[PDB]
Chain length 362, copies 3
Amino acid sequence: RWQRALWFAGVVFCFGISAHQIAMHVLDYLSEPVAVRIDFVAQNELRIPEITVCPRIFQQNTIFTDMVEKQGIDKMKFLDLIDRPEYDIMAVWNLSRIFSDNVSCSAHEGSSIISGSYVDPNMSQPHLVYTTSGQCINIPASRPLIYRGVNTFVRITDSQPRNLDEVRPEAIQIYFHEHHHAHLSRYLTGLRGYIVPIANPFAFSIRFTQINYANRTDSPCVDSEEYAACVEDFIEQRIYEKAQVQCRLPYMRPKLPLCSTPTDARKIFVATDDVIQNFEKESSCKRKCEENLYIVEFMHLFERSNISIDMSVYFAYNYIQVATEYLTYTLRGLLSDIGGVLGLFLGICILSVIEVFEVVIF
Amino acid sequence: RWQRALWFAGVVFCFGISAHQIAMHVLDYLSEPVAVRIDFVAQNELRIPEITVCPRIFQQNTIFTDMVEKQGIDKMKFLDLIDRPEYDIMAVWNLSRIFSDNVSCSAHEGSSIISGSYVDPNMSQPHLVYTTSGQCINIPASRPLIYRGVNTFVRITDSQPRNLDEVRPEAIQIYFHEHHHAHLSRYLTGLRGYIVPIANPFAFSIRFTQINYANRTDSPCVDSEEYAACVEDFIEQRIYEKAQVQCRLPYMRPKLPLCSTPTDARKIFVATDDVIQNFEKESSCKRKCEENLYIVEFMHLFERSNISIDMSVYFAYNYIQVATEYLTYTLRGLLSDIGGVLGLFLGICILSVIEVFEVVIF
Amino acid sequence: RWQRALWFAGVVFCFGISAHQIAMHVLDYLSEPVAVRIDFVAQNELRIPEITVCPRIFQQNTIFTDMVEKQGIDKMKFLDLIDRPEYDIMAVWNLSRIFSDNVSCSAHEGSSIISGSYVDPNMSQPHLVYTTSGQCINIPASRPLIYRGVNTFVRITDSQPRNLDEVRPEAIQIYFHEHHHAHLSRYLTGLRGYIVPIANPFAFSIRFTQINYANRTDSPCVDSEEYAACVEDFIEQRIYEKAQVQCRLPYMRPKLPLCSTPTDARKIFVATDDVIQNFEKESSCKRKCEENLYIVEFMHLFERSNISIDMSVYFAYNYIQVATEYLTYTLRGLLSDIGGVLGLFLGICILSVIEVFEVVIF
């Protein structure tokens, strides 16, 4: 009668639906759903960016364009200076040098009502680097600043002889990038670096956002060290294969000999221009698990010193906005969900399965 | 004996409590609980606000008050100028004009270490608009800026003949609002717009925040186009109803004829003053699903040009803070929760219900 | 036979695992997990911080050290001035006064195109306070500002006779802290306060973040009133304990008599310096579950008045970033999870336990 059909249809439908929701739950657990927790952590000591300070790009470089035009070359063919015997690529890129060897990097953690300021003139002194925009300065940021008060800043001070013996530069370009990303300093300082004059020294103000990601199979992340090496290697490989030449430029690692003719130098330079525009979207390197963003606002300076190039970077805000991406839907949740799925419709437990197996085996 | 009472009490309590949690779960599932996910998306191209640049409000308008006072009128009765024959409302509000027809809107995406800047002087040139603050300029923001470098800005430049033939204005008022909100530009520029001088041209810095909401039955949202039309219609309808007159002012859509006497013009203007104050809280228009906020910081400009009214708007930060409101408690979760509630206490499945029905039908 | 061993092993394993997940679920429910919801609330009226305006710390105080040096003491021993009979500690700390009795605090909620600005010169006028940095001013912030437009600010203005009869001060220090925190104003203004000149009056710009925490047993909170009292009591108690003296300084509550000799005053001052550095980390006072953060950006002021000490605090952004920490995993969820765990493997309901009890009782 209709009883057989009714019961069979009910059992088949219940089994099918149980399979459907158990499969959906297992599938989404494998998808590793992840939520985001936002908090504002107050820091007793801040982790400074690496601060790469370049001059303006070659065409925008006052002091470099002035001395390359006197040779009799246009405002674009600054690499044609290589063709001359005495001038080589390294000599050409040493002319862009804006900072002398007197650059200092002090760290002022203003505090101690009883003892005054907290000057520290020996915090990871600057060192030379070669960037696409010339010969620049780099601040390794060896140690984290100790935050006590809003008067916590890092002051880059150069006191070269600003006189009429030579034409002085008009501005510099300071880029605050990740702690150990060497590709961001030698390639992207001229793009992401804020241009600031040196005649009137004002200050920046860095606020810290941190984004911790979850290492997921469908969207894996890497540590801050692997990502930098991956991205750099990709950048030089891409530039080398696009330029189709076997020479390099000062801002490239010493894998190949320096370019010695204007044609190859310009080929490499244009290849770098093309690669740097899309090195992010057109790159396979996995995102680093921890991403630090440095919101750079401006800040007036009331007392302007007589130093040549004074540049203060304030860290008056010690509340890092931390967004931690944490993985929800643990294994216990999946098991409970499966039990609920097969507890509403059906009613077979993990205990009756042993009964079925014993019946089968007798 | 006590067995009957004990068993009946247990069964009734279990059934009632099962109903209680099943009802609670279905009820909060219907409430559609929703969580928020925060992320920082890096954009290869930015979506610029619409930028409405007015003069300061009529009373604070330098060049307008100076010209209405010579007629012999007070600093408040600028609408009484209508009573004179030659002067009408449109003529009165054309005298507040501050920008000439030479205004241009360039878009500089600083890049190209090889080829220099990326000036683009034909980005959605400005057009006239009649605001409560007078005769203002609007920048529709037709296309999104391509972000490559921190030197990404939009520069509004007017080069009118700043001479002694006429008294020059002292400041303007720039409001960065969403794209197709014709009510924000035409009513709220004088209140929400930042006042900036024109003698010393500096720049703003816009950081984008985005909030995507979930369309919920108990908290519905509309698209950015329906909300603007709803709010604009509400504002004009409320102004007309409160003024109890059948004319309008240049900043109102051409639904009614322009007011031609000081009394009606002042009635409409006061009605607008009273409506704009509480237009958002005293309005039924449902919020928009996607809301964009433009955090406007200030920025220092080192090179000040000789142009009359020069003003850059920098977009050096390409990390949009996106807050996406996503619905938790999917139907699968509701079914699993119901099964769990029905499996801890009770023990009837959706498989025993078919047995009950078959017994009932025999 | 193997049937008995198989069945016993299956039953024991199922019971043990059921106990394991039930224990894990009950334990994590007791752990009381909590998620964070982020939103941007548009406020029609803003809640202003308490603004404590000090002079620069004694050593950096221009007008104070200038006259201290006239007596003939070094730049460290300003407390040695106590030894002279005419000068006591209160007299010494009254000499650091920078603000006269003419200080006023206006509130400008710029709006009303029909009526102009909204000056309000009677908004919680400043009052005297004693801080570690001298004799300062405090702005209790009695009422919340009504936000209508970006021209919403609080203007602190002092018009003392800036002439050559006396040497004028160089700068001040404004600290924006929570309302009823008397320890922040009297101890941490010299450290956490932004230093700004008074010759060139510019403006700040405060943006509001709010973090509401959940009162959890493992992470308890207290209301904003209990936390301030707890922390203040801790600070004074620790200062007294470390100084090992039974006197105080003007910036301490009148629990003990004022120090009357340089030795005790210096001991108390050094103890204060040591305590304030680690007063927050090295303290037991439970956090408050409503923490307000005041992001203080800078702003350009176009019109500079002739007033002696003028400073505006703009509140042009009315979107408070609210992070509410809401408690997930309610009791219903725990019961559903337990039922799911108990319905997957096992299959004994809360209804079968009553049967077991009735069998036991017969």
